[PDB]
């Protein structure tokens, strides 16, 4: 029985739009924890993001929708799905439509902080590729995560 809820840190993030994941961008998300409240059909996302260089924490609440999709507001509208789940990682596929209406597809590899297991990384890169996102559009989040634990 897989436990999806708990501590989850971001290791890598791929994106179709580089403007959304650079330094201080809305999607350079340093995950801290994700909670799946299936009884209440909600999802609790906690993370840090940089704006003007300093770390800023976020505690969002998303609602479960059709299939395995989750709706959540942040820098536009988002619809994300947990494409992959193992005992060491989680791979999220998210589609964001910002305030300007620009559509951006993104992917992310989440772990228990730690150390990255190449097995999950290869799956992340494969998912990223399948979404038409090139390898050069992948950023290493762990190297950039200096935000509070
Ligand atoms: C932000 C993309 C991947 C981050 C890891 C978990 C998602 C929680 C916040 C999702 C908002 O998109």
Domains and CATH numbers, the chain: 1-149 (2.40.128.20)
Nearest Cα to Cα of residue 28 among 62, 97, 63, 74: 74
| Span from the CA of 29 to the centroid of ligand 1 (angstroms) | 7
Strand spans (E) along 18-65: 30-37, 42-51, 54-64
- The pair of structure tokens assigned to 45 is 């996302």
Elucidation technique: X-ray
Residues 138 and 64: their CA atoms lie apart, in Å, by 27
| Span from the CA of 31 to the centroid of ligand 1 (angstroms) | 7
Residues 81 and 10: their CA atoms lie apart, in Å, by 15
89 lines ligand 1 (CB under 6 A): no
Q: What is the resolution of this structure in A?
A: 2.2
| Span from the CA of 53 to the centroid of ligand 1 (angstroms) | 20
Distance of CA 54 to the CA centre of its chain: 20
Distance of CA 117 to the CA centre of its chain: 17
Residues 65 and 131: their CA atoms lie apart, in Å, by 21
- The pair of structure tokens assigned to 145 is 């995560």
104 lines ligand 1 (CB under 6 A): no
| Span from the CA of 1 to the centroid of ligand 1 (angstroms) | 23
Residues 141 and 149: their CA atoms lie apart, in Å, by 14
Residues 47 and 10: their CA atoms lie apart, in Å, by 9
- The pair of structure tokens assigned to 127 is 């998912």
Q: Going by DSSP bridges, is the β-strand pair 6-7/103-111 parallel, antiparallel, or unpaired?
A: unpaired
11 lines ligand 1 (CB under 6 A): no
């Amino acid at each position: 029985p897989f436990e999806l809820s708990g501590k989850w840190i971001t290791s890598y993030i791929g994106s179709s739009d580089l403007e959304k994941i650079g330094e201080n961008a809305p999607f350079q998300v340093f995950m801290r924890s994700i909670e799946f409240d299936d009884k209440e059909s909600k999802v609790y996302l906690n993370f840090f993001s940089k704006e003007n260089g300093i770390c800023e924490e976020f505690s969002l609440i998303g609602t479960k929708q059709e299939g395995n999709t989750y709706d959540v507001n942040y820098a536009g509208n988002n619809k994300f799905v947990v494409s992959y789940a193992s005992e060491t990682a989680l791979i999220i596929s998210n589609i964001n439509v910002d305030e300007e209406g620009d559509k951006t597809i993104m992917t992310g590899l989440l772990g228990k902080g730690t150390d990255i297991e190449d097995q999950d990384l290869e799956k992340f890169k494969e998912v990223t590729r399948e979404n038409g996102i090139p390898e050069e559009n992948i950023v290493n989040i762990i190297e950039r995560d200096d935000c509070p634990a």
